[PDB]
Amino acid sequence: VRKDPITKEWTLEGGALVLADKGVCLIDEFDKMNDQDRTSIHEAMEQQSISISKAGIVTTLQARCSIIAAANPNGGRYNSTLPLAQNVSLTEPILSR
Amino acid sequence: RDEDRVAIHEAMEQQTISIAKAGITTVLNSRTSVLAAANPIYGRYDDL
Amino acid sequence: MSAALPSIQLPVDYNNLFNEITDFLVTFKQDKGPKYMAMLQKVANRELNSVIIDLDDILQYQNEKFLQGTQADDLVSAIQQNANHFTELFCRAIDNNMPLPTKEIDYKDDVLDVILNQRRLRNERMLSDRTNEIRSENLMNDALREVVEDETELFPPNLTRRYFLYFKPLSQNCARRYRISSKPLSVRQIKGDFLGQLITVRGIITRVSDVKPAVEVIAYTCDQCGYEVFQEVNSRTFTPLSECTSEECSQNQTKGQLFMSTRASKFSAFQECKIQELSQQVPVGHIPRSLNIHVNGTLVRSLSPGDIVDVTGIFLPAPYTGFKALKAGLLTETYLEAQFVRQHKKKFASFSLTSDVEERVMELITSGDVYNRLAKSIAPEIYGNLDVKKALLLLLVGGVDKRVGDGMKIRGDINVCLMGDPGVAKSQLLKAICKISPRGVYTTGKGSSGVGLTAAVMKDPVTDEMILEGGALVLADNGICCIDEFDKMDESDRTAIHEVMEQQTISISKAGINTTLNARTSILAAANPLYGRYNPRLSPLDNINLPAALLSRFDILFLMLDIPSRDDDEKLAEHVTYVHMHNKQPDLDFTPVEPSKMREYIAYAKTKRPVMSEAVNDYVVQAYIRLRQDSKREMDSKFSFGQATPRTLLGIIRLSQALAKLRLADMVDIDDVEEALRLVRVSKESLYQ
Amino acid sequence: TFFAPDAVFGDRVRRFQEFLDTFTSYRDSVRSIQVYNSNNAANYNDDQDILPHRIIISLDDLREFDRSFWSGILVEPAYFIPPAEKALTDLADSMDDVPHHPWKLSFKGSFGAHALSPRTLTAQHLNKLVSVEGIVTKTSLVRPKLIRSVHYAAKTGRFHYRDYTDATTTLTTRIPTPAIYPTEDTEGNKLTTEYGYSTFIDHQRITVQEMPEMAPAGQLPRSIDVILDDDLVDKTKPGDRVNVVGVFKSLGAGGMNQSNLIGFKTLILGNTVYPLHARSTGVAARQMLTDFDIRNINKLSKKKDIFDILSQSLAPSIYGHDHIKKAILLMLMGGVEKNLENGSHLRGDINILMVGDPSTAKSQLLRFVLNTASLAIATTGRGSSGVGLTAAVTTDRETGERRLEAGAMVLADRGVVCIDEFDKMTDVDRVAIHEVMEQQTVTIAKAGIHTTLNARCSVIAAANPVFGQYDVNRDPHQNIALPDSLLSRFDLLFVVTDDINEIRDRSISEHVLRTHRVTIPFLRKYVQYAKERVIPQLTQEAINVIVKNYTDLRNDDNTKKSPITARTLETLIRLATAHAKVRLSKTVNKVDAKVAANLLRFALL
Amino acid sequence: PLRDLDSEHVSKIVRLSGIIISTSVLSSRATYLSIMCRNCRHTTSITINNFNTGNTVSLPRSCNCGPDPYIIIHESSKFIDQQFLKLQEIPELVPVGEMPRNLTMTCDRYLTNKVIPGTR
Ligand SMILES: Nc1ncnc2c1ncn2[C@@H]1O[C@H](COP(=O)(O)OP(=O)(O)O)[C@@H](O)[C@H]1O
Numbered sequence A: 001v002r003k004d005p006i007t008k009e010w011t012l013e014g015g016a017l018v019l020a021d022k023g024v025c026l027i028d029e030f031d032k033m034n035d036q037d038r039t040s041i042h043e044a045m046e047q048q049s050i051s052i053s054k055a056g057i058v059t060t061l062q063a064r065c066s067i068i069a070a071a072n073p074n075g076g077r078y079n080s081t082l083p084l085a086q087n088v089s090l091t092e093p094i095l096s097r
Numbered sequence B: 001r002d003e004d005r006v007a008i009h010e011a012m013e014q015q016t017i018s019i020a021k022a023g024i025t026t027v028l029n030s031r032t033s034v035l036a037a038a039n040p041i042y043g044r045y046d047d048l
Numbered sequence C: 001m002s003a004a005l006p007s008i009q010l011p012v013d014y015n016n017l018f019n020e021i022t023d024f025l026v027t028f029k030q031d032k033g034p035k036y037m038a039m040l041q042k043v044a045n046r047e048l049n050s051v052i053i054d055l056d057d058i059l060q061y062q063n064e065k066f067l068q069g070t071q072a073d074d075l076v077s078a079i080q081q082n083a084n085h086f087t088e089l090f091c092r093a094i095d096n097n098m099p100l101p102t103k104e105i106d107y108k109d110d111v112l113d114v115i116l117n118q119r120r121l122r123n124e125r126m127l128s129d130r131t132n133e134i135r136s137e138n139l140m141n142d143a144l145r146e147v148v149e150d151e152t153e154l155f156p157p158n159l160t161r162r163y164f165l166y167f168k169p170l171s172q173n174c175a176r177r178y179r180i181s182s183k184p185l186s187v188r189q190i191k192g193d194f195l196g197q198l199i200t201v202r203g204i205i206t207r208v209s210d211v212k213p214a215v216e217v218i219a220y221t222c223d224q225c226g227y228e229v230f231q232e233v234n235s236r237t238f239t240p241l242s243e244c245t246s247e248e249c250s251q252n253q254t255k256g257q258l259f260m261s262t263r264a265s266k267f268s269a270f271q272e273c274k275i276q277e278l279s280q281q282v283p284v285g286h287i288p289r290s291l292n293i294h295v296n297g298t299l300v301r302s303l304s305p306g307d308i309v310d311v312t313g314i315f316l317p318a319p320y321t322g323f324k325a326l327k328a329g330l331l332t333e334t335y336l337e338a339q340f341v342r343q344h345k346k347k348f349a350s351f352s353l354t355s356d357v358e359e360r361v362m363e364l365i366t367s368g369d370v371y372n373r374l375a376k377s378i379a380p381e382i383y384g385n386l387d388v389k390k391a392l393l394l395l396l397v398g399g400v401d402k403r404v405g406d407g408m409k410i411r412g413d414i415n416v417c418l419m420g421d422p423g424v425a426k427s428q429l430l431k432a433i434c435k436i437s438p439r440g441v442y443t444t445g446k447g448s449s450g451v452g453l454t455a456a457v458m459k460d461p462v463t464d465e466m467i468l469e470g471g472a473l474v475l476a477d478n479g480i481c482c483i484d485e486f487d488k489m490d491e492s493d494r495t496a497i498h499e500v501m502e503q504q505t506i507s508i509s510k511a512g513i514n515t516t517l518n519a520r521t522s523i524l525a526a527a528n529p530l531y532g533r534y535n536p537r538l539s540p541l542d543n544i545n546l547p548a549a550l551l552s553r554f555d556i557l558f559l560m561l562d563i564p565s566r567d568d569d570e571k572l573a574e575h576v577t578y579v580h581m582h583n584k585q586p587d588l589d590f591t592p593v594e595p596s597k598m599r600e601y602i603a604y605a606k607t608k609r610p611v612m613s614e615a616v617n618d619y620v621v622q623a624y625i626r627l628r629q630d631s632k633r634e635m636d637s638k639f640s641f642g643q644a645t646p647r648t649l650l651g652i653i654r655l656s657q658a659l660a661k662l663r664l665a666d667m668v669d670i671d672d673v674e675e676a677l678r679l680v681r682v683s684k685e686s687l688y689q
Numbered sequence D: 001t002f003f004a005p006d007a008v009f010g011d012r013v014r015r016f017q018e019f020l021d022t023f024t025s026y027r028d029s030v031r032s033i034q035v036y037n038s039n040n041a042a043n044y045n046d047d048q049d050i051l052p053h054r055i056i057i058s059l060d061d062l063r064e065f066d067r068s069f070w071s072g073i074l075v076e077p078a079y080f081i082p083p084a085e086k087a088l089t090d091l092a093d094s095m096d097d098v099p100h101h102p103w104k105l106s107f108k109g110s111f112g113a114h115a116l117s118p119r120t121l122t123a124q125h126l127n128k129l130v131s132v133e134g135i136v137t138k139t140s141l142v143r144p145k146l147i148r149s150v151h152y153a154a155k156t157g158r159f160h161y162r163d164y165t166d167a168t169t170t171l172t173t174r175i176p177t178p179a180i181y182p183t184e185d186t187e188g189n190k191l192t193t194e195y196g197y198s199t200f201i202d203h204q205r206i207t208v209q210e211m212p213e214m215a216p217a218g219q220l221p222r223s224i225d226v227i228l229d230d231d232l233v234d235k236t237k238p239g240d241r242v243n244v245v246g247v248f249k250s251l252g253a254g255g256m257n258q259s260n261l262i263g264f265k266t267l268i269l270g271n272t273v274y275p276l277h278a279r280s281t282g283v284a285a286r287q288m289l290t291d292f293d294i295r296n297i298n299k300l301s302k303k304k305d306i307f308d309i310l311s312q313s314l315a316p317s318i319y320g321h322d323h324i325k326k327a328i329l330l331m332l333m334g335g336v337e338k339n340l341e342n343g344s345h346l347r348g349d350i351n352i353l354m355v356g357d358p359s360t361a362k363s364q365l366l367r368f369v370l371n372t373a374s375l376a377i378a379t380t381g382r383g384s385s386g387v388g389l390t391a392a393v394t395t396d397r398e399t400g401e402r403r404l405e406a407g408a409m410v411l412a413d414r415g416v417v418c419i420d421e422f423d424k425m426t427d428v429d430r431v432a433i434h435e436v437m438e439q440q441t442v443t444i445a446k447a448g449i450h451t452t453l454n455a456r457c458s459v460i461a462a463a464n465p466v467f468g469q470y471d472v473n474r475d476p477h478q479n480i481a482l483p484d485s486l487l488s489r490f491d492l493l494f495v496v497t498d499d500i501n502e503i504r505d506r507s508i509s510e511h512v513l514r515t516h517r518v519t520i521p522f523l524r525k526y527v528q529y530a531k532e533r534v535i536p537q538l539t540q541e542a543i544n545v546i547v548k549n550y551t552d553l554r555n556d557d558n559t560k561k562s563p564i565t566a567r568t569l570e571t572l573i574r575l576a577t578a579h580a581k582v583r584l585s586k587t588v589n590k591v592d593a594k595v596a597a598n599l600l601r602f603a604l605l
Numbered sequence E: 001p002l003r004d005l006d007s008e009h010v011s012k013i014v015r016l017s018g019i020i021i022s023t024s025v026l027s028s029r030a031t032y033l034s035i036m037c038r039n040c041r042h043t044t045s046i047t048i049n050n051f052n053t054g055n056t057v058s059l060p061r062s063c064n065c066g067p068d069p070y071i072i073i074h075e076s077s078k079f080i081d082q083q084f085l086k087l088q089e090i091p092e093l094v095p096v097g098e099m100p101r102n103l104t105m106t107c108d109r110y111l112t113n114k115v116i117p118g119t120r
């Protein structure tokens, strides 16, 4: 929930997830994402809803989105014979989703 | 996270969170009973 | 009309009181010429700008007029309770009786003295002309004078004075005379019921913005009708008048236009300063309050930040409120006005005399062995470490610096460290010193931020703008600064302090600041060795975490290490039990030197600027080679610190030159220098115990 | 004559005679005030040769006495309060009539309908006398308010007078007359105003938020401001928890007036403004000891074994730890305070640490410390920001004046600060805690307001062992994990083990069982009188004991264990004096010294 | 849909759904206000039964004596409450390009506090 441009009352806004509900959410370069976002995506996949507690506004918005992602392997084209989870940075539990 | 992890492990026993930040020192109530599901590491060997 | 704006009588009568005043001034006894005649002449001879009134000598005036009647109405209790009106009335009382000519006005002399003169002169000639004319017509001789005086326009007295009037309230011996006007007060202690009274407060000055001209009355010049137009001016703002008020430009068809002349008008030097609660007086909870103060005329510039002061002034309101919708009305917002200033911790090095005050120095001198006596007399509250204190006396004294004539400077002062842990009460010495020394300031690392020592640029309210406000180092300079927890200060701070031993400098290049401000500060730093305490299996410089770039700057590093000793710790325990048990520590026998008179002695010490003899010079040199060579022949580790870099030499010359000053010297004898070496070797070398 | 007396008013005054005459308790109360002033009036005059005028009135009374006058005040304060005040003024003028003002009423209560919190308020409750509680913020700066004027006039001598009626004067509305500020008397003489003759009355307005503990789960808070005058001014600082009782006004015109959305600014007049206590905030002990209690103490002080009973009274739910409980008492009392002449002061209070495996109740003990503690704020780990600091809050608040907002350790002054997970706390803070604990003061140079402000608080801390359960066997050092000077600053370092035994186990079992199926009340009352009365000073009975002891400690323990310094000695004296307070003795004793010895031993061994 | 409101809906009953961003501090309006002329000393009353934010009713202009003398008496006047809710469309859909638009509400008396922000 963010203060508006110029001078205006505070409007609520969803992330890509809320905005795209029933539709298709398209994200790329997970590896470059700040954890603050990572938790949001994780939550969205987990319970199919984003909860917002700030400021006074308190809800659960519903994002049912299909996530399609583009990710970049750590370093080279094929980083190792080692398994995919080892091949890329993204932790195994987020990947299991 | 760490900072709120402290808060939890102090909360679950005495049910009350205590916040001394700035001009409000309030001690506020959590009567909640936590149900947590952790994820263990490395699999079956962690049982070994 | 009556019954609107009704009348009410009061015990107060100004009519007779004015006359009482006139009897008091210009006719007096206690202090062949009576005090106020002569003083007022020294004002009339024009060498003295301010005229300082005392309520004390007024007390004695009344006990003279009481006895020895007839009964005279009480001035003083009428004075404290109002005090605004009496300035102006007292003022006209004075204006009448003055030595009249009293002497030539020369050339300079001064400006604004001549304008005054010519105003008084034209003031006389007008009357002479009018009476000369009237008498010509006709048709005892008092009358015509009266007529002339009341038909003529003259320069009002208040516009031509040249001098200011201030009051100093009574404490003191007089309070127990017995005889209120000075009860030093907290800013909590001020109820809003005291408005108008003459009150005395004690608190810390802060802020205290730049002095600038404020205008009491404005002069315009019609240029057509001639004349002048003086408008009195009040509060914050005014509207400049136009057209003309001239009696000759009245009722005319065409009014002339006028415009101001800043040379004619009456300006006062205006300075505003805030005072905060002394922080001891604060009730257990809450927070220290703030209070505004104004300063006009002579008292200006007498006040500075980081001062603990008794300010005595007549306390008056000025109209304000918060957001317009926030007032019930009319409120006042108030402020304090400043008549007279009395500073705790009186400030050296500035005093002229050295008149009968030397007497107050002599009780200290005559007993002899001043150096050990004072030494012990710094922070007696703690036991032991006579050496440490022995040096701290020098720190307080300092000197002599030098100027190479080209020129560049060489400090100039002493820099002390106190090492060791956890106990030994190292920081109590620092609360001690920062209590004794004026312009001392106590800070800690995390604590005092990097922005705490450097000066920020912030917009200045009222007078403008964007003034550099510093803290710590700038706030305390020309005097001792004190630091605790000197390890935890991190990095950016250490660079400041690392640089300030070039003295005379900080350089702030950031953002809105290019300035290089001057910090003349002294530094004392209490620090703890690397954890936990001084591991003897580690070399020095290992258990001192500090770089060698910085320590070379410190001239004296006192490392206080604690090894338990059955004999001594008994003595200690006896001391710390004796006090608490008593408040006063020394008995049988020593006399602890009161910090006030001590500060006086040190003040009289800093004045000397001694010079070295040839012999002591050569001795310093030879001993310096031996110290260099012995420091380096140490070579690898243990022991140390090396290398005994030249700053230790200059340091010991400077310590020498300090010890001299407590002899008052100018000689700088050999035992002085030798003593400096003693203090130096004793500083360290306590790590062998 | 004004509008001349009306039998509405006439009856409303006259009927309020019998009460207060019955219940008569007030009739002499007023007298008392008079008395207190008189004596003090005799103190200024003769010796070198005050109180507020409002008297509380219980609403309890009216119900029995007058139903209609009750229901009336509550429902219509405007009409019943000012005649009541009139009556009491008349009476107060009767009590002592000879030597030569509002005399307001409190309205305690016995609330109320009309008991309501600032969240649920207006418009049915509008213009009725309300009881509204909550946090007090942001408060406000006190300003004197001008009421009467005085002027001097030359050449005719004389003087003058004027009166000023604000929107908030009286209670009921009145046809507003602006008086200007009289100057330029007619006939045309100038008027030099004079001060100190012209009276003033102080003025303050504080806004009250709804209670954060009684707050809804989450939502924005909503507050209502209150105006306070003269005697009521400045009573409460921002951050206190306060019950405000007073009228609720509609004052002002709401845009209906100027013909060309928002409307009718509303605020509460007066009236009682009670400061009160709630956990972690705002004093309040208080306490009332009456006649009987103090006697109980006095009787109980003589008994020789009391200390052990007391020390057992803390722990209904906790085994053993008699030594630690003893400690917590000895913190509650705390060695007086001693500020030398023209010199630094030696620390009075005692600080404590607890280290042991979890389940040690270390976090459980502290809450019970908190409850009976009389203050103070609790802090758990991180925690912060600033902990005790004012943080030097930027910016403004309001109009651009830089002001300080006091953190915990400042706000906790004269009290017991708790610290949980004391190890977890960032070193950055610890650096400050050094300054807080021993030195006893806080110093803020930040930007800024540059001041040394005082936090003299007592301190407890519970902190987990370094890694796992290893505390028990592990070395006297490397076990603590938080070197170094901190270890010293704390007067007592107590170690507790969770190591298990079957016997001790059984003995745990039964008490745990019974729990699920010297009274705490009298404890704190026992404590306050003990605290302000009376400080035991120090005696030559004891000193040689603590000296022997101390020297023993250094010499032998420096072989045994660590750390030991002069600090330990200081602590010895504080403990001695504290146990003296427990004994109520006007003096320190040798026995006490032996006690201090004991607990510092179990600290060490 | 909140997105779609024609200008032909003005002063007609319109029903729509959304998500409340914010509700506002209560304010007080006057349903019954007894008035007094200051000079004339005459007394009256104005009772406003229904109102929207108009502003519906202003004090009269006539009791010389004038301009409008009338003083509101606050002790005998009765007041009510007013909220100002502010409704946003569900952030879910369907802006897709833009900052979603909102309308302002006014609730009188018994419609106050019925709603916590966040409640659909
Ligand atoms: N010789 C002494 N005389 C008096 N007090 C002492 C002495 N040595 C130690 N102390 C006590 O030890 C305490 C140490 O306090 P402080 O200086 O703040 O910390 P540190 O021990 O780090 O210097 C002081 O309060 C002081 O009372």
Ligand SMILES: Nc1ncnc2c1ncn2[C@@H]1O[C@H](COP(=O)(O)OP(=O)(O)O)[C@@H](O)[C@H]1O
Pocket (backbone or CB within 6 Å): B013, D317, D318, D319, D320, D357, D358, D359, D360, D361, D362, D363, D364, D365, D512
């Ligand atoms: N001496 C005791 N008697 C009874 N119960 C105890 C005792 N010590 C601890 N407990 C139990 O331990 C729990 C408190 O755990 P605690 O030791 O406070 O955790 P932490 O180590 O985080 O402080 C409580 O449920 C309490 O019942």
